Design an enzyme around this catalytic site. Structure first.
Site: not given
Lengths: 216, 216
Positions: B12, B14-16, B19
């Protein structure tokens, strides 16, 4: 291939991360210069300790000038540097990745949820919190699933991931946790004990767990 | 040397942890088949996803049947298996040990204390918790000390440890967190941003952080 002088380990006997490092070094046939470091006395809070380790934690490895803390980083380093073979921590990327995942699961999930439950009970005299307990029990469920079809957490052979994870299982077994219903863990626990038995399992892990058990 | 097919990543934006993996793949010049897995739409709770990942988390790496989660284990695997050289994650035992410690520090301390602090404020719309704020600032204090005499967290060159740590720093900066008092982090952040700039820093990390920032 071997360290030039005995590797110093700033440790404490009951400490779980310390116990994992000690057993790993036994399998690699490395003798550690053990140095006790009291937490209540603030022996880790000295100007000498802070310069060596700004996080002031245990264990702290001193391999002749090379300083390292975080138990799982120490475990893997000792195999990579002083291992006679790579059996505990294989170089094969896919085999190493599975171990790394289990090591990450241990630090980030299993051991974290162990601390969230037992630390308030052991050191603060607090009650058994069920919400924290359910989380840790969920982690034991996941660990049970990882052992489905495998004799060890990362595959066919015992690894550094087995050595660190078993410390948590040894701790709860000393407290009074009956995990025999988790049949994959139960069989693995007996298997890993047998493997670590000639490598100071009673001496390191059981003794350390019993010391924590006396806080209850 | 190269994967047989584009490595699938159930992710996903926005998932840190997602990323961190995406940016690591970009530096190694690896294309990822990005599959959007909506968490609270129940897409991770499907029977097919549970068979692949019983922990039902993101990201999940699918490299031609080889299933792997835990972002930091994925990062390290990508370099070990498909890295043109070992610059991001070197074979040298001592050089690897420092990175592994920083990876363990990130999972064990920095990211955990980030989640405890920001998760209630972002998703639940809750106020800032003081005890959790003290812990996270302490974690940044240690990070600042690790960067003493070092351009990067693990040494002279940018490593996978920088890539995963910078995600948390990108997030807090987007939430309006001032860390200029931590001079080493402030200089390191600007440094790491530019180092990852030609490897899709804006499109991955900044875009991701802004999606989380909208919740405030």
């Amino acid at each position: 291939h071997m360290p030039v002088q005995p590797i110093k380990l700033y440790y404490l006997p009951p400490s779980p991360p310390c116990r994992a490092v000690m057993m790993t070094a036994r399998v690699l046939e490395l003798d550690l210069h053990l140095i006790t470091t009291n937490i209540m006395n603030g022996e880790h809070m000295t100007p000498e300790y802070l310069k060596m380790n700004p996080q002031h934690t245990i264990p702290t490895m001193d391999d002749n000038g090379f300083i390292l803390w975080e138990s799982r980083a120490i475990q893997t380093y000792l195999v990579n540097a002083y291992g006679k073979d790579d059996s505990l921590y294989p170089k094969n990327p896919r085999q190493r990745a599975i171990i790394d995942q289990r090591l990450n699961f241990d630090l980030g999930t299993l051991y974290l949820r162990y601390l969230n439950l037992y630390t308030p009970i052991l050191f603060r005299g607090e009650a058994y919190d069920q919400e924290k307990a359910d989380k840790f029990d969920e982690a034991l469920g996941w660990l049970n699933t990882f052992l489905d079809g495998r004799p060890f957490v990362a595959g066919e052979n015992m690894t550094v991931a087995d050595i660190t994870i078993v410390v948590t299982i040894t701790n709860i077994d000393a407290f009074g946790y009956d995990f025999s219903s988790h049949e994959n863990i139960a069989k693995w626990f007996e298997r890993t004990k047998k493997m670590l038995e000639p490598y100071g399992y009673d001496e390191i892990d059981v003794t350390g767990a019993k010391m924590l058990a006396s806080f209850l």
